[PDB]
Amino acid sequence: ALSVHPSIGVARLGNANTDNFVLNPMEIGGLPYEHDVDLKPTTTVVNFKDEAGCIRRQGQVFKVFGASNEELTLDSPNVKNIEWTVHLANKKAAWYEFRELNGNLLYGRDNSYSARGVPWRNASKTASSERQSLIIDLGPRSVSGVMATVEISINNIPETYLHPSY
Numbered sequence: 191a192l193s194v195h196p197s198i199g200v201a202r203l204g205n206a207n208t209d210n211f212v213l214n215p216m217e218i219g220g221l222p223y224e225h226d227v228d229l230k231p232t233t234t235v236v237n238f239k240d241e242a243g244c245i246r247r248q249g250q251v252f253k254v255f256g257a258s259n260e261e262l263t264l265d266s267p268n269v270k271n272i273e274w275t276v277h278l279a280n281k282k283a284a285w286y287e288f289r290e291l292n293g294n295l296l297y298g299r300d301n302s303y304s305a306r307g308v309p310w311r312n313a314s315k316t317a318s319s320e321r322q323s324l325i326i327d328l329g330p331r332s333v334s335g336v337m338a339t340v341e342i343s344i345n346n347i348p349e350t351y352l353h354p355s356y
Contacts, residue, residue, distance in 0.1 A: 192262075193255040204247025206240045211247040222248045229337070264336060277330040278342055284324035287311050323355040 204211065212222040213231050223231035231251075239245055254262045254272060264272055286293060286308045293303040315321050329351030333340050340346070347354045 191256060193259075195253045195255060196250070199250040199252060201250045202248040203245070205244035206242075206246045207244075210240055211249050212238075214248065214250045271334055273332055273334040275330050275332050276342075278328075280326040283311055283326075284321050285311060322353065326356045328354050328356060 200214065211225075212235050213225050213229075215222050216231070221234040224233045224235055226232050237246075252274070256262050262269060262272070286303050287310070289306070289308050291297065292301065292306045292308050294301055299305065310321075312321075312324055315324060328342055328344065329347055331340050331342050331346065344356055
């Protein structure tokens with residue numbers, strides 16, 4: 191019965207300082223939000239760029255629900271802790287070249303990548319290990335507590351995650 195919203199989160203690329211960000215628009219065709227020191231949304235976005243003309247990052251707020259569609263927080267009676275594990279990656283370089291509707295299984299087994307002979311990106315790399323390391327994967331990052339900050343960075347790679355690539 192425990193639900194995490196949104197079902198699929200959306201963040202956007204940002205040129206600005208790592209600490210200068212906006213938060214997720216609350217509705218379809220809605221403007222992103224400015225936020226206060228507690229990282230709560232306030233007024234809608236004033237400027238999308240900083241004074242240097244760099245685009246600010248737009249973040250995604252994830253909410254946890256339970257019992258009878260009630261929002262669950264660290265400020266809740268029976269709630270001791272709330273821990274999040276996020277695993278982001280980029281397989282782009284290890285996948286097939288884009289050939290429009292080629293590779294799409296909704297058109298049948300005969301429209302599959304192999305049957306169509308869609309070439310791999312970075313075709314020179316044949317071995318599975320070589321292609322495994324064509325991915326940009328820095329492992330998962332767990333994040334609990336009040337006002338925590340943890341980068342998905344090189345260095346930050348946990349000893350537990352044996353196969354990182356970048």
